[PDB]
Design an enzyme around this catalytic site. Structure first.
Site, PDB file in Angstrom:
ATOM      1  N   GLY A 122      93.126  21.181  79.456  1.00  0.00           N
ATOM      2  CA  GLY A 122      94.065  21.797  80.372  1.00  0.00           C
ATOM      3  C   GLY A 122      93.452  22.230  81.687  1.00  0.00           C
ATOM      4  O   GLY A 122      94.180  22.433  82.656  1.00  0.00           O
ATOM      5  N   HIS A 160      99.334  18.961  75.671  1.00  0.00           N
ATOM      6  CA  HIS A 160      98.872  19.290  74.313  1.00  0.00           C
ATOM      7  C   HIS A 160      98.411  20.718  74.107  1.00  0.00           C
ATOM      8  O   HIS A 160      98.145  21.121  72.971  1.00  0.00           O
ATOM      9  CB  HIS A 160      97.839  18.278  73.785  1.00  0.00           C
ATOM     10  CG  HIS A 160      96.468  18.426  74.383  1.00  0.00           C
ATOM     11  ND1 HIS A 160      96.048  17.651  75.425  1.00  0.00           N
ATOM     12  CD2 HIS A 160      95.435  19.229  74.032  1.00  0.00           C
ATOM     13  CE1 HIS A 160      94.781  17.984  75.724  1.00  0.00           C
ATOM     14  NE2 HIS A 160      94.399  18.921  74.893  1.00  0.00           N
ATOM     15  N   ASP A 181     100.189  13.668  79.850  1.00  0.00           N
ATOM     16  CA  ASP A 181      99.656  14.872  79.217  1.00  0.00           C
ATOM     17  C   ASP A 181      99.505  15.964  80.257  1.00  0.00           C
ATOM     18  O   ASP A 181      98.393  16.298  80.733  1.00  0.00           O
ATOM     19  CB  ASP A 181      98.306  14.574  78.535  1.00  0.00           C
ATOM     20  CG  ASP A 181      97.802  15.731  77.674  1.00  0.00           C
ATOM     21  OD1 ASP A 181      98.574  16.674  77.386  1.00  0.00           O
ATOM     22  OD2 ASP A 181      96.597  15.713  77.314  1.00  0.00           O
ATOM     23  N   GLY A 217      87.925  23.123  74.038  1.00  0.00           N
ATOM     24  CA  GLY A 217      88.124  24.415  74.663  1.00  0.00           C
ATOM     25  C   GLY A 217      88.294  24.306  76.168  1.00  0.00           C
ATOM     26  O   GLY A 217      88.672  25.284  76.826  1.00  0.00           O
TER      27      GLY A 217
END
Ligand SMILES: [Ca+2]
Ligand SMILES: [Cl-]
Ligand SMILES: [Cl-]
Lengths: 223, 34
Positions: A178, A40, A84, A175
Site C-alpha cells: 500500500g 488488498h 490493486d 508490511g
C-alpha cells in the site's frame, strides 16, 4: 523494506501508516482528506497515522485520523491482482505542515530506468523475524516491461510495473503493502506483490498509478 | 480475533489471529492470519 536505509524523521511526509490496533499497510497522502493504498489492504476499522517516524513511540508529529470511507477500485481482480488500488477518505482533514504533506499525482507514466523512492515499515529481512521501528527507504529503478514479464511470465498486467533489483537483497517486503513508489516527486506506484521479497530475479511488482488518475479524481469529487 | 486469511500486523501479538499465527503472505506484501 529489505536492503534500504533509515529515511530520517518525516523526510517522507506523505507516507502514512494504516492501523487497526497495529500497523498493517502503508499508504500515500494525496490531499488533506485522501490517502492512496492497495486494494488488498481493504478492511473495516482503519485509522490513518500521519507524521509517523518511529511507529512504536510517540515523537510528537503524529496525527491519528479515522478513515470514514474506503473505496476499492471497482475492477480490482483479487485473482490476478489487476487494479490493486484503494482510496481512503479521512474523517477530518489532516493538518498539513512540513512533516505531513501530500504527494502529487503523476501527469504521465514513468519510463523504464526512472529512479524512485520506496518506503515503509515492512520486514527488513527477507526471511525470519524483523523488528522495524523507524521508516525505511529504498532507491530503486523502474525495470523494463520486458524484464518484468521475464521475471514473472504470464502474470504482469498493463497496470503493473516492476521496480528494484534482479540480484536480490533490495526490495519492499511484507508490511510495506500500500506504500508509495515516488519518482521525480510524483506517486507512480503502490507496493503490491512479488515472489517473496528480495529474492534473486524476482523484483517487486507495483500498481501503476498513472493509469488511475481519472478514477482517483472522480472518486475524490464524488465522495 | 481475526479469522484465517485476514490481514494482520507483523508488529502485533499472536492473539490478533484466531489461529495464533500472523505470518507473512507469500505474495502480497502484508501479513495474514494462518
Ligand atoms: Ca510515532
Ligand atoms: Cl503507529
Ligand atoms: Cl481484470
Amino acid at each position: 523494506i529489505v536492503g534500504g536505509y533509515t529515511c530520517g524523521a518525516n523526510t517522507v511526509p506523505y507516507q502514512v501508516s494504516l492501523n487497526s490496533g497495529y500497523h498493517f499497510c502503508g499508504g500515500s497522502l494525496i490531499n488533506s482528506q485522501w490517502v492512496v493504498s492497495a486494494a488488498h489492504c481493504y478492511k473495516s476499522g482503519i485509522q490513518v497515522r500521519l507524521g509517523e517516524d518511529n511507529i512504536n513511540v510517540v515523537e510528537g508529529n503524529e496525527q491519528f485520523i479515522s478513515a470514514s470511507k474506503s473505496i476499492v477500485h471497482p475492477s480490482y481482480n483479487s485473482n490476478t491482482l489487476n487494479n490493486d488500488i484503494m482510496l481512503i477518505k479521512l474523517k477530518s482533514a489532516a493538518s498539513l505542515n512540513s512533516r505531513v504533506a501530500s504527494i502529487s499525482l503523476p501527469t504521465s507514466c514513468a519510463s523504464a530506468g526512472t529512479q524512485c523512492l520506496i518506503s515503509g515499515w515492512g520486514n527488513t529481512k527477507s526471511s525470519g523475524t524483523s523488528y522495524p521501528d523507524v521508516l525505511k527507504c529504498l532507491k530503486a529503478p523502474i525495470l523494463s516491461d520486458s524484464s518484468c514479464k521475464s521475471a514473472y511470465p504470464g502474470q504482469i498486467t498493463s497496470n503493473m510495473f516492476c521496480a528494484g533489483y534482479l540480484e536480490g537483497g533490495k526490495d519492499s517486503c511484507q508490511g510495506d503493502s500500500g506504500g508509495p513508489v515516488v519518482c521525480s516527486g510524483k506517486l507512480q506506484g503502490i507496493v503490491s506483490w512479488g515472489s517473496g521479497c528480495a529474492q534473486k530475479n524476482k523484483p517487486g511488482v507495483y500498481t501503476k498509478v498513472c493509469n488511475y488518475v481519472s478514477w482517483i479524481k472522480q472518486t475524490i469529487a464524488s465522495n | 480475533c481475526s479469522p484465517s486469511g485476514a490481514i494482520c500486523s507483523g508488529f502485533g501479538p499472536p492473539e490478533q489471529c484466531c489461529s495464533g499465527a500472523c505470518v507473512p503472505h507469500p505474495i502480497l506484501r502484508i501479513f495474514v492470519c494462518q
